[PDB]
Design a protein around this ligand. Sequence first.
Ligand SMILES: CCCCOc1ccc(OCCCN2CCOCC2)cc1
Ligand SMILES: CCCCOc1ccc(OCCCN2CCOCC2)cc1
Lengths: 155, 155
Amino acid sequence: IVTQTMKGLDIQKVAGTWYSLAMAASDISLLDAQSAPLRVYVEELKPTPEGDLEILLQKWENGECAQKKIIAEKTKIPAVFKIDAENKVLVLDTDYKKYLLFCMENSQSLACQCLVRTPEVDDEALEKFDKALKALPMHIRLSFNPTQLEEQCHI
Amino acid sequence: IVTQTMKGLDIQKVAGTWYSLAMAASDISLLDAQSAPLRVYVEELKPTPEGDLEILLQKWENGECAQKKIIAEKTKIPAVFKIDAENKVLVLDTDYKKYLLFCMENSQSLACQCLVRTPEVDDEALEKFDKALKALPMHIRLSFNPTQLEEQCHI
Ligand SMILES: CCCCOc1ccc(OCCCN2CCOCC2)cc1
Ligand SMILES: CCCCOc1ccc(OCCCN2CCOCC2)cc1
């Protein structure tokens, strides 16, 4: 369903600190509550030397903001990785220095994010995210202010 | 804060059947859950002869989809009405035959909607709603498919 990907992705250069500035999803129920399944906040991305991608994130479950770690295994397409359960991650676009657009999907369920390096509202990167999105059937879209970004689980 | 209004509003011609196709709000907490305070679905608008506006809507409270009725009292500006508690309703735009854009606000808390006559996705009217919105600090946006539109409380 998502037919936008980044050409030439250097997976090593996305390592380190990120902020989930915005999130959208095909179904309201995937992002609606604090503990919605795809309301996940990205802390940091760790690409192994052999080209896999470890993701550190945060996730409200049972009243608490928990850390989580997950490995997204590489594929033959450099902009596409696999998490196990089945789930595909796709990198749509990034300039490495400021923003990164990604989506995750199954086999028409879908959630995408605007990751940014610093705790600021980047209008430019939200435009691009909004453009990449109009091509997709989203029904819920959220965004966070600089205060919430510095908080665990964006409270 | 919202500085868009409709010139020449004929309040009588908005009477009757409407569908809340989309909703946006300044704070996630105003629309996030089924029972969020501004997650209100519009059923029908009844403009009195003396220019006031009765609103029939639906609202999930305590496990059930309840009907509600409210009166929005007129003002000297024909595109602005008052509900009592304090709350201002503003009509931003409408073509009467298909769509109506409105916002409601207090004294920087804000929620807006794309109302449409029929249970269809009107891309045109969602554009306009999205344009009217970029001028505003929204942090949550939702939209409903034709099935959910025919259901009480859009389930
Ligand atoms: C290159 C882009 C990196 C972002 O990739 C993802 C980050 C988080 C994801 O969320 C997976 C959901 C994690 N679950 C939380 C609770 O259930 C178990 C794991 C998926 C991809
Ligand atoms: C001309 C546009 C008509 C839409 O106007 C409104 C429709 C619903 C509104 O919602 C008011 C919130 C209703 N509350 C629900 C639970 O608390 C008590 C009333 C406000 C304006």
